[PDB]
Design a protein around this ligand. Sequence first.
Ligand SMILES: OC[C@H]1O[C@H](O[C@H]2O[C@H](CO)[C@@H](O)[C@H](O)[C@H]2O)[C@H](O)[C@@H](O)[C@@H]1O
Length: 433
Amino acid sequence: GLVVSFYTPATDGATFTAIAQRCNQQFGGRFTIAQVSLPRSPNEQRLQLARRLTGNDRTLDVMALDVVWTAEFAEAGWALPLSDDPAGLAENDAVADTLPGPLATAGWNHKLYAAPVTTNTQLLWYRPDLVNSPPTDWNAMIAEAARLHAAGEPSWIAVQANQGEGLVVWFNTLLVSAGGSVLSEDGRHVTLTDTPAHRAATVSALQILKSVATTPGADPSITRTEEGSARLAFEQGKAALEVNWPFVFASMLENAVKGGVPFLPLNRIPQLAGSINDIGTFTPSDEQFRIAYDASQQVFGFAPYPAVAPGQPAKVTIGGLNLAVAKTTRHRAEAFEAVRCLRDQHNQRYVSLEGGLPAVRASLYSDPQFQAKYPMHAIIRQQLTDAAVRPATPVYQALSIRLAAVLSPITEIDPESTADELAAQAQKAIDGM
Ligand SMILES: OC[C@H]1O[C@H](O[C@H]2O[C@H](CO)[C@@H](O)[C@H](O)[C@H]2O)[C@H](O)[C@@H](O)[C@@H]1O
């Protein structure tokens, strides 16, 4: 039968290949989904897709889009509205049993242009054997890192951010938590410095970035261009504090069982032998999960994203992936049917428990079987309820490149002058409409 191509970030390729393989057993030979990988950064994911869409690649069917690409892809006509499903089923499927934060990321001008499949929100991860209590706010993060440094313990604050989208995400979370916003609601005005309250919020966020950058024991790689992984930095013992998306939980257990985490040698537990399956995925029994998780609790804990102001939780920038059907497809009906299978209940459970990516289905966050294997479920659902959002705008690509070039390196931030530079660069981006 026909093949529905399914483009996804390469780092999620194995997870989505597995989901596609399950979805291929249930179409009655009518068709096959074929996963195809995209590059690592959101901007290169977008670029590969945009070049196929403008090139009229008629083999491109389903795309897993970062949440920030909806406006551009809807406005360009590249993502079909869900109302273009010939079966008329896609819109109701996308909303039913789906958390509202993820859904909002999939809309443009009051219509859905994609079906959420994964969401994302950052948590604090820490070494409980080195850090007595998890820092509750950024001042406490800095104080704990300085303490670790003076004790000769690992002292980096490993935030998943370099010089790209992740740095923009970090800034956006600090900014919205402080009451600021990059753009107005409609995306037509820059709101970083246009009122005193907005300017004060921008300055407070930049002050946090600069303070973290210049804390004793800070990662010397802030001032370098080389890409870094906060996930690997922590797994290697180079940081005892990490701010990152929740896939690091699955990664900690799997890499520990593979032998890749020196302070958690789960591969030396005979009961865990053979729990990595034949293509490299940790697939434990219930007992093996208990053993691995219980052992991990001595050296790996999680907690809310640090607060920006003492006494109120942060507003944490939402992330994730939405499934869109490309205007190029020669088989809209099967592409939308594939989208519904790829996000069904069983595959949502899989994408979180094995793939490490937070599910979008509200039912799972209320399901004790899911909660038992996804122990950060309550913090995740709370942070998705009061999430910050990056600006929705068709010129997001240019806005984010401009903002990230100003913010990096964060050691060079001067709150007041950087605030004005950010606002001017943001204005250049939206002056391309
Ligand atoms: O779970 C890990 C995912 O990490 C990246 O995506 C997240 O981080 C991006 C950069 O800050 C955000 O734009 C995105 O919305 C987040 O989901 C990576 O791009 C994904 O492939 C990973 O699944």
